[PDB]
Ligand binder design. Structure first.
Ligand SMILES: [Zn+2]
Ligand SMILES: [Zn+2]
Ligand SMILES: [Zn+2]
Ligand SMILES: [Zn+2]
Lengths: 363, 363
């Protein structure tokens, strides 16, 4: 009977794919309790053109008229400063997402994070247009050479100097280290923000997923359903992520990285697709964590206030003014989420009970 | 063509299952270049009785008359010291294998390695009969009682105190740390053997697989076919394992832990079976490593002399005197190993090339 008014919830890291998969998952954004979604661009082929980002958003708006969609480009050599200015002036994108080549789904067309200088004309134009630079901050793996080996466990830590250099060279660019998974990165974000007093001072933030608040290496060792990028790491990393999430600091906010794959793309003996599907119960998953940490009073900031502030979402842009209301009615996560045709997805924590449910209230 | 006479090769950690899988796999020990095989006991039900170990070996000899089979008991709750004496006097077993409960394939009937004391009567009986104690040295995972958590990454290291205590309390017992995967374990095996001048001084040895000389956590993160227990760990660990393998030291020798699973037991979204199948090309896999390390002169020790010496294999036990001849005829590993009815196995490094082949010549 207990209720929590979360206002206009934000999930600032969403994958919704194309085709029938997109038709299945895009309505689940609302169902999971999320009013505003930042849409990632790693389609096959990636979103690097204006007409395609415009059509994609309209496709999503058609599937979910009440959901507010913030769009992005895929960082590529095909981008030009002129296209960035055009797209921004037309309100076609709110940011550009960087995938290092080879580290995750549809990242083959991505960048080498040692030569970020080649994209400085893009970053310079983004800075002028007040667009957000989103980073999948992992260095590609390297096991030889003069230098310390890079592997799936330290690839995020190895990326942190690139983050600092970018922030140094573009001090007015808004940058997000997406889905932080390590204690090292959490401290780097806090240290970057030492001189910050009010939320609007934040230039560099980090998003935290639902699943990295629960998972450890043991949970995906032998369970491809829990396998994602960046990989879930050690218990002390999980502890640092949970403390960051409930900290009340304005530079940590929710981005699910809900990444749907059909079940047959997870049940492979080689080349398992990375990604965990959390859209259907996004806010209830987070509520579980905030309850367990006795920190429900900080929930609204993490899943609403801080993301709205960082992305500067105006009320004149929101597709619906309905507020997400959390109510303490227990539910069971289904075993599968299916369109009743050719697509079955295994949802995060399939079979488990959640203490909270979410509904929508006008006004 | 370059040739090396490896003599009577031994693989001191072999899984051959039962039924049709056994019929497929047991002839491959020889085909893979191995003369002597130590047969692990984690069948359903585990091998804990005298008649079953006898019938099993007799089944294996029918399938491969020229292979020398050294047999084992599963360390289990219904095993007794008398059975240890009876089994040894009949030469029905050469050792007893310990599985910590829940840690790997068919280990549900295994032990709690925090309280080994209930098995000390077994160990004392093993000590008198000069039997080998084989250890899957991993402590089961714990994420609760805030003493340190242990997970798939540190579970081997967390077992190392248990190994030392067992060695201390039974100084005349031959003990093997099977399939070592971490630098920590290598150092501990070295420390225990600080004062050994010749092979017959070795009481505590360590076995090394083929796959852990190639694999890193990066190789199995998205590839269940490369998932095994203990998991392949970091580049620094693999570097320690490779160095140990080619070191020429008598306390390191080859044990493949070739662990066959049908392909559908690897292509799961959860509950992927742990194990890598290396039997078909066991010796050629190892040769590759020794060539790349410019240490082919140490190959014979690693795959023959040291295992024969530690297990004290006599010419009177050997099923065939044929010698394994390694010859540098390049070959390609197939994509599948199949019996042509219900069983397909994905071999280690499937599709790759090896510099060497193996053949058999009479003495
Ligand atoms: Zn990502
Ligand atoms: Zn993502
Ligand atoms: Zn084992
Ligand atoms: Zn084994």
């Amino acid at each position: 009977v207990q209720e929590i008014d979360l206002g206009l919830t934000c999930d600032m890291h969403v994958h919704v794919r194309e085709g029938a998969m997109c038709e299945l998952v895009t309505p689940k954004i609302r169902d999971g309790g999320v009013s505003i979604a930042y849409i990632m661009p790693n389609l096959q082929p990636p979103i690097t053109t204006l007409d395609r980002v415009i059509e994609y958003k309209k496709t999503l708006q058609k599937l979910a008229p009440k959901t507010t969609f913030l769009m992005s480009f895929y960082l590529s050599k095909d981008l030009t400063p002129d296209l960035i200015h055009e797209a921004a002036q037309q309100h076609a994108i709110r940011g550009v997402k960087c995938y290092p080549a080879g580290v995750t789904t549809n990242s083959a067309a991505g960048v080498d994070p040692n030569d970020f200088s080649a994209f400085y004309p893009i970053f310079k134009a983004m800075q002028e247009e007040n667009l957000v630079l989103n980073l999948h901050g992992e260095k590609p793996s390297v096991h030889d050479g003069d230098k310390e080996p890079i592997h799936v466990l330290n690839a995020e830590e190895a990326f942190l100097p690139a983050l600092k250099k970018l922030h140094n060279d573009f001090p007015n660019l808004k940058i997000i280290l997406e889905h932080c998974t390590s204690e090292s990165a959490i401290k780097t974000i806090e240290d970057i923000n030492k001189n910050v007093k009010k939320a609007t001072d934040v230039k560099v933030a980090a998003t935290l997923t639902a699943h990295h608040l629960f998972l450890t290496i043991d949970d995906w060792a032998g369970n491809p359903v829990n396998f994602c990028k960046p990989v879930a790491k050690l218990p002390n990393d999980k502890k640092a992520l949970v403390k960051a999430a409930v900290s009340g600091k304005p530079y940590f906010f929710f981005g699910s990285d809900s990444a749907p794959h059909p079940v047959q793309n997870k049940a492979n003996y080689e080349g398992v697709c990375a990604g965990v599907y959390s859209q259907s119960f996004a806010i209830p998953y987070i509520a579980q964590v905030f309850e367990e940490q006795n920190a429900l009073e900080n929930l609204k900031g993490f899943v609403s206030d801080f993301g709205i502030s960082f992305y500067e979402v105006k009320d004149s842009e929101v597709a619906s003014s309905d507020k997400a209301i959390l109510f303490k009615k227990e539910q069971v996560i289904p075993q599968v989420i299916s369109d009743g045709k050719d697509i079955s997805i295994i949802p995060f924590k399939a079979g488990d009970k959640l203490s909270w449910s979410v509904r929508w209230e006008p006004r």
